[PDB]
Write a protein that binds this DNA or RNA. Structure first.
Lengths: 108, 108, 105, 105
DNA sequence: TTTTTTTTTTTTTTTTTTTTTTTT
DNA sequence: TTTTTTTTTTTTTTTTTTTTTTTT
């Protein structure tokens, strides 16, 4: 089933690069994407979407090398549903974006 | 900032159509989108993304009239970050998709 | 069948706007969007896709009041295959983008 | 500049595959994707966009082994503007889609 | 297949063409 | 601008064309 996400945002923190026990690079970036919209009066408003994106392999390292907090970037990937047991034994779930590619937007 | 979601999925429940105190129609649908992928062995796996989509106005009613539990549909919209205080006074947040359009996929 | 196009490009000429009998606007814009690829035997390349986009209603109006040659815009829409005949009966064809929306940066 | 195309279409002819000097595959497919619009003065209309897509590497191979005239597929890629000259020097142009990926239903 | 927590302009219709070195 | 909780096939390169009535 087709699952596609395309978002332009800026990092809310520096990218955190790690290696998984397996050897694969992994990274998670925090994105903030804002939208403007007119209120039924004439007021202009804003919604800010905060969301984490998962990176793996070469993509994770590319992100760690070229992006930093505040960086602007276009991310392309899929929507992800994470479901797991925390160390307390409590069921927990999460929605993240698993990114396939990044389009750097810092150069102006 | 560009914020786009395009997902094909099936409803996990019947669409729940309501009117907001303002008069606007609103509806929320539960989607399930599954992905298949090969495991580093040769096993084929699956991830299932469960996610809610918000509909408003004519879109909400269109959904309520033509879609039901198990229905296949293509949704196009944006990623949304919901943040609010529950009736207990506790901070709560959520990621949903706010849908702009629906492409029906039940007719075969 | 799903048909989506999302592209960022600069206008290659000014907006051309007319009005239909119904009264709704209809404009056409010329776009240019480039891609860099330092992928080749050795060095860096550049490809530019030139293409026209059809605009309708209030979108065509917004394009007409705010865009001009050189402007950068993001458009969403679908791919369109246009065909017709010459005054000499020679049938012609063409691909364009029919935009649903516009976002200017 | 961002350049995205996502389209579902049926193949209008069989897959045409060759191999480049490097050894990687390169195929071309003809697509047709239709849109319904019961929007007009009164009744229902239908438009079909015909367009060719360029495939490379293993994607071209998968297209060659599993697709044929009539097959339905979802392709992702970008819009491409191709140009060249006649043997008589007449310069030609063309729009195609260069696919990054393929998904067959 | 992979872990586990606030960044910094608007929203069916007709027509028939030549141009504004950050990774991948 | 808007509420508040498990559905049912694979993943820089060259070439130069005519076809497989669910809403919007």
């Amino acid at each position: 089933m087709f699952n596609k996400v395309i978002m332009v945002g800026r990092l809310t923190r520096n990218v955190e690069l790690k290696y998984l026990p397996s050897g694969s690079a992994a990274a998670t970036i925090g994105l903030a994407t804002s939208r403007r919209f007119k209120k039924q009066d004439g007021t202009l408003g804003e919604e800010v979407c905060f969301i984490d994106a998962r990176l793996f392999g070469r993509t994770a390292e590319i992100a760690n090398q070229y992006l930093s907090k505040g960086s602007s970037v276009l991310i392309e990937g899929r929507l992800t549903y994470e479901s797991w047991m925390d160390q307390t034994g409590k069921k927990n779930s999460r929605h993240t974006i698993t990114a396939d590619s990044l389009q750097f937007m810092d150069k102006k």
